[PDB]
Design a protein around this ligand. Structure first.
Ligand SMILES: COc1ccc(N2CC[C@H](N)[C@H](c3cccc(C)c3)C2)cc1OC
Ligand SMILES: COc1ccc(N2CC[C@H](N)[C@H](c3cccc(C)c3)C2)cc1OC
Ligand SMILES: CC(=O)N[C@@H]1[C@@H](O)[C@H](O)[C@@H](CO)O[C@H]1O
Ligand SMILES: CC(=O)N[C@@H]1[C@@H](O)[C@H](O)[C@@H](CO)O[C@H]1O
Ligand SMILES: CC(=O)N[C@@H]1[C@@H](O)[C@H](O)[C@@H](CO)O[C@H]1O
Ligand SMILES: CC(=O)N[C@@H]1[C@@H](O)[C@H](O)[C@@H](CO)O[C@H]1O
Ligand SMILES: *[C@@H]1O[C@H](CO)[C@@H](O)[C@H](O)[C@H]1NC(C)=O
Ligand SMILES: *[C@@H]1O[C@H](CO)[C@@H](O)[C@H](O)[C@H]1NC(C)=O
Ligand SMILES: *[C@@H]1O[C@H](CO)[C@@H](O)[C@H](O)[C@H]1NC(C)=O
Ligand SMILES: *[C@H]1O[C@H](CO)[C@@H](O)[C@H](O)[C@H]1NC(C)=O
Lengths: 728, 728
């Protein structure tokens, strides 16, 4: 189509995908920002209005970064002075504006450097975290109420996660939890006291004479973990003459035996809380169900309703114990479990009863549970057409499980195989957002009798543009290795010719429970290599990958750097055989777990790879964190799994890089995979005298994501593959 | 048709340069190790006796790093467990061997981890420093007495120097100096209590889980500096029970008004010390002369006896103020002073007089005073043939200063033009080492009639071998810039063909008072690029280089990054306009100051260079140490030189790097020139979208010196250069 998808295009975002992030405020209303206007839409009639103008906050004085309107549209929250921290954490300054007046509140302002703020899910209450301590405001313009006093930088964490808990448990800086009533604030408290500190330089502005030493409590594999406690406080009982009484919930006796984690917090009623707990060795979780006791002010967790999950083949859950979805009354829940055959399905649990009944069964898995009315449970799975790369909305009749209706399979079979959904409060309606293989297609429906109300976004604008570009095409078959199908994808060059011979970059992640072979439509770096460089970028989902059941996913257990590695090689050795790939020119790249694998791949003696880039890789498991690593690897002790911690380093293969061209990249200020692991790689490559190219990004963290640095890495990498391939 | 000088040859040191290290013991004998024996030789008749048999300590249990024998006979020190700190500093363990018995001393040993040890200049007394505190041994089997009790790690330094003093002041760990008697023991104290700390990671063996943060007190340009007191102890009054009395020597009033350094300590007679102090603004220097008072037990430095050095032109001395050589009676001394015409020549000062008398004059400079007698002074200059880049030994009779003989000039004018020298006590004999342009020659001579005696080592072994390889030849000549001669050398490929058009590598250092163009014979990396890769490696001494008088050296005063850079460019251009250098292939590289300049050049826009390599550069003067930088730049305050400190950063020039190909190398443990510096450069080159090559070296320091890192960095640099030049 004459023009080509270009490196600058990718880097400078010539072609933006349109989205439709709506926020539901009820059973039949969502909020939507249009450029800078905030609009409320009626889902039923499609009619809408200006809720808040883009102009309303012009004489405010600080660039506004986000809003958060109270769940009664009474007050709006204004987030400014945003300073980022790790992957979710940050600090920000806040203001509360009253919507029934033309007025910001002057009195008792939320203080600067707030680590976290949140409305109640009803009315206009606030919890915030300032200096690792929890505060509470009934009324926006009232003195706040302190709830903790134990907080201490880097040592005591009240209502907020420490590093491990942010990245590897809760996927959230948040460790607060309102009861639906807004009555009860529940919260976690972490004790980071004897957690060793990762240390590294941050150089900052040129003007900074001496570089600063950044120090973060970070348990690497085998070190001391943070400890956790749980508490529930009662907001309606708060006195300002008196201190507040948290009530400690303690953990199941069978957890206190040794180290453990609080992994899941789900409220169930106005008065019932569900806590989950994971043993340090992550194959034993225990759910507890705790009820308020209006007479004694206590919380009680009866053993009778305690439940247990324990993996016998690997670890519990995909990355953790599943979320349990609770039927309205509070006496039953559904939650995804590994069935007896290894596949993950919806399971039905009744509070004081034994076992659970499974409502779904088969050679596919459920991805998640999305909503629960009284007649139906709604859920996403990968059942359709046996595509583990796919995702679709399903609906189950509760009074007969066998009655399932695929709400999404058939709406657009050619453009659509990957969905996600956003149910309205009480599930009267839902936004369906398709993600490929064609352009993102945002629709809106009603559960009643599933009636397609309205298209909300179709990317027509982008669809017109992309017609001028000689786009790559995406292939998505699978190979057989033993008797098993493992899936792979190929981003193919325009005017593809299976007669010709093409360079192949093997794009890897391949960590535990990964999926790099899907139907999602993506505009990215691989999009460029293919369109402009006629380079076949393949990916492959082999042993240890997700969504195909424990036999594949758990093949990797206590054994990283083994199967996942070999199998990438294998996939290549297959691709090679195929008539359109020139084997003298096969490459491999990867970031995070992916960069780990690539390096291991290159140091394997395979013969199959000319070159590869590896980006901020892991090099030795003892360097990466406890919660993630030990989930997969056990403990680095002689009596547990030390041997294999030592068999699976990048360092011990070093000699083999003699036979390949290697580019290794790391951001100095990566709090996640520390520069250490790359630093150790280079030293070994040095000790043994092997040439390789390098690049550090002073101050860049794990993302290497600042717009300037981001452009730099893809440029550098683009030159490297272009040169490694003989590309002019 | 012979083989060629190859990277291997260089890296594995195939062709070795044999040496003749000796230590004069008296005016007639000297020590020498020969097949691991320690021998004493007679200078007069050639004959040698075995001082320490190679056999002894075959059974010591430890490998011995160095030995050291009492001046007066009877003991030898054994140095084992050496652990390198900085450039001169290190830690080790010691045993004493009593020569009048097959016996090591058992009792009262020197402690492990000792910081410094010294015999006194006569007898067998020991002065040692351990945990920053000074200890003295009257006999080696007796308990030592303790002199200082104040030493505290990274804070108070008794008898050893700290980082700046070590690196920039005494080129030494030792901050100890005995009287010639061995009666007194003067030592300096350093107080780094408020000196800021540079910190960087050390990653250690891949088995170290958590990176160690190294903290080194290191005053950066304009930072708080260490302070120094100075002391002298009578070692002939020591008591087993009552602490030792260190008499303090106070700096002069005109150093005590602001920050200052102690920068030279010479004993004159048994009872007289010479101290040179130096203001922090290195403009102004005082020498103080202190006699001992038999009655008072105190030390007095008569004011009227002070000797002041100024400079309007730059700083005092080549790198620090110069060293006084005293007459036997200690009422006069000779010392290298820059003269009226800017040239460094020899001056005769009388203690209780105030001016001096120049004893040499000319359009050449004195490099060093080598030996003084009742009759003769001996020195080294670059007078011969007006070749500032060569060195000869000369001789003045003191009864007539015009009566001057050269002693080395005519030994072999084709072979030898770069001497150093080594005189027995009372300059009765001397050893001459010629370092080029031929293979080094080591001779022994008689002072009486300046007669030839014996050839020590003549490297005839190397000569045999070199006859089998295609060695590059050297051109050492000059060019004219604004009516001034400036010198360069070229390392020319064999069978040089002036009508062919060779590629040029510019080898730069160019720091204040450097000299890259000279008559010495090196077997190095230039050798290989010339002999194998047919690359002219050329060096050039532009403005700010030394040994040619102050007009050239001080041109750079207060303005580094400027003329030394223009003048490097200019050189390259004139190398262009020679019919043997192809201008499309001009590279440049350097280390330390070499890299600052390489970097500054590459980013000047001259577009006269295709590519360069900067190894551990400075990048902003505010990052480098106070003593060095402020010598040539003054302070980085707005009242001083802040403006220029800013004008002269690598960073300001990131844009031009678009033109050139860059390769930024640095080790991560660089205590000297901190990684910070290169980190800031690449952050600049990223901020503005310039591709470039880089290479960190894990845990290496400024000299990237370890066997594996040395072999590597040179490999890497060779790939980059050959490819820069279309050389396969
Ligand atoms: C929100 O986007 C996320 C969240 C988590 C996330 N991972 C969380 C679990 C692991 N920490 C994972 C990872 C990062 C770095 C190295 C390794 C081995 C694994 C990274 C990745 C990610 O996008 C790539
Ligand atoms: C023995 O070899 C030495 C000794 C000292 C020495 N210098 C000591 C004085 C200065 N610190 C000098 C220097 C200037 C600028 C930058 C750097 C890193 C070093 C380096 C250099 C050197 O070889 C190059
Ligand atoms: C969000 C929105 O404007 N929805 C409107 C609502 O305001 C109005 O009450 C109703 C009656 O026409 O129509 C609908
Ligand atoms: C909202 C609030 O109280 N915090 C402060 C505000 O008082 C101040 O004007 C400014 C300077 O710190 O930063 C913000
Ligand atoms: C006024 C008030 O209630 N403050 C107290 C605080 O001083 C004390 O340290 C803490 C002990 O838990 O309880 C709270
Ligand atoms: C032994 C010594 O001199 N220690 C001093 C200390 O007395 C003083 O308070 C400090 C100020 O930096 O300097 C150091
Ligand atoms: C945190 O833990 C340490 C020891 O692990 C303990 O001494 C300290 O008091 C604890 N603090 C709190 C408030 O939990
Ligand atoms: C050299 O020989 C003479 C005569 O025997 C002797 O006195 C002298 O000690 C010898 N020199 C050495 C090195 O011992
Ligand atoms: C010194 O080191 C040795 C080990 O080499 C040890 O036996 C000795 O006790 C140490 N301590 C002393 C004597 O300072
Ligand atoms: C030590 O000296 C002897 C004879 O003096 C020499 O021949 C031998 O090779 C040497 N051996 C050692 C221990 O180096």
């Amino acid at each position: 189509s004459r023009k080509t998808y270009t490196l600058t295009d990718y880097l400078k975002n010539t072609y933006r995908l349109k989205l439709y992030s709506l926020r539901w405020i009820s059973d039949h209303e969502y909020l939507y920002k249009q450029e800078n206007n905030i609009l409320v839409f009626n889902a039923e009639y499609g009619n809408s209005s200006v809720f808040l103008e883009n102009s309303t906050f012009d004489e405010f004085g600080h660039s506004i970064n986000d809003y958060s309107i109270s769940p009664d549209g009474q007050f709006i929250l204004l987030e400014y002075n945003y300073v980022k921290q790790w992957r979710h954490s940050y600090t920000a300054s806040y203001d509360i504006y009253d919507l029934n007046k033309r007025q910001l509140i002057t009195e008792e302002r939320i203080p600067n450097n707030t680590q976290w703020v949140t409305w109640s899910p009803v009315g206009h209450k606030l919890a915030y975290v300032w200096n690792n301590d929890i505060y509470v405001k009934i009324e926006p313009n009232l003195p706040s109420y302190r709830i903790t006093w134990t907080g201490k930088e880097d040592i005591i964490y009240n209502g907020i996660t420490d590093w491990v808990y942010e990245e590897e448990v809760f996927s959230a800086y948040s460790a607060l939890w309102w009861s639906p009533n807004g009555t009860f604030l529940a919260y976690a408290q972490f004790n980071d006291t004897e957690v060793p500190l990762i240390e590294y330089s941050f150089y900052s502005d040129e003007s900074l004479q001496y570089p600063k030493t950044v120090r973060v409590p970070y348990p690497k594999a085998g070190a001391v973990n943070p400890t956790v406690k749980f508490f529930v406080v009662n907001t309606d009982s708060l006195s300002s003459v008196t201190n507040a009484t948290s009530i400690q919930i303690t953990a199941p006796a069978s957890m206190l035996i040794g180290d453990h984690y609080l992994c899941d917090v789900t409220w169930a009623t106005q008065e019932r809380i569900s806590l989950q707990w994971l043993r340090r060795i992550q194959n034993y979780s225990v759910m507890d169900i705790c009820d308020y006791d209006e007479s004694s002010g206590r919380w009680n967790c009866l053993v009778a309703r305690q439940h247990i999950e324990m993996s016998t083949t690997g670890w519990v859950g995909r990355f953790r114990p599943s979320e349990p979805h609770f039927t309205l009354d509070g006496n039953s829940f559904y939650k995804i479990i590994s069935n007896e055959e290894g596949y993950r399905h919806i399971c039905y649990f009744q509070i004081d009863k034994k076992d659970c009944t499974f409502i779904t069964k088969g050679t596919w898995e459920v991805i998640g549970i999305e909503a629960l009315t009284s007649d139906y449970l709604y859920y996403i799975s990968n059942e359709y057409k046996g595509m583990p790369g796919g995702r679709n909305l399903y609906k189950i009749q509760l009074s007969d499980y066998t009655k399932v209706t695929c709400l999404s399979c058939e709406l657009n079979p050619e453009r659509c195989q990957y969905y996600s959904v956003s149910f309205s409060k009480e599930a009267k309606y839902y936004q369906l957002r398709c993600s490929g293989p064609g352009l993102p297609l945002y629709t809106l429906h009603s559960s009643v009798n599933d009636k397609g109300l309205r298209v909300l976004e179709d990317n027509s604008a982008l669809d017109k543009m992309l017609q001028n570009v000689q786009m790559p095409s995406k292939k998505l078959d699978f190979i057989i290795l033993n008797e098993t199908k493992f899936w792979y994808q190929m981003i193919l060059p325009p005017h593809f010719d299976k007669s010709k011979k093409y360079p192949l970059l093997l794009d890897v992640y391949a960590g535990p429970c990964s999926q790099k072979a899907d139907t999602v439509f993506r505009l990215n770096w691989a999009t460029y290599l293919a369109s402009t460089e006629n380079i076949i970028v393949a990916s492959f989902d082999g042993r240890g990958s997700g969504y195909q059941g424990d036999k594949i996913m758990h093949a990797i257990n206590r054994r990283l750097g083994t199967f996942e590695v070999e199998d990438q090689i294998e996939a290549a050795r297959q691709f090679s055989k195929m008539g359109f790939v020139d084997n003298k020119r096969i490459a491999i790249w990867g970031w995070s777990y992916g960069g780990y694998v690539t390096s291991m791949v290159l140091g394997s003696g395979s013969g199959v790879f000319k070159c590869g880039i590896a980006v901020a890789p892991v090099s030795r498991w003892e360097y990466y964190d406890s919660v993630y690593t030990e989930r997969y690897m056990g403990l680095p002790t002689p009596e547990d799994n030390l041997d294999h911690y030592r068999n699976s380093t990048v360092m011990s293969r070093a000699e083999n890089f003699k036979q390949v061209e290697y580019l290794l990249i790391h951001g100095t200020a990566d709090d996640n995979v520390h520069f250490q692991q790359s630093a150790q790689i280079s030293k070994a490559l040095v000790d043994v005298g092997v040439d390789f190219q390098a690049m550090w990004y002073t101050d860049e963290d794990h993302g290497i994501a600042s717009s300037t640095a981001h452009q730099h890495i893809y440029t550098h990498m683009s030159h490297f593959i272009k040169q490694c391939f003989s590309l002019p």
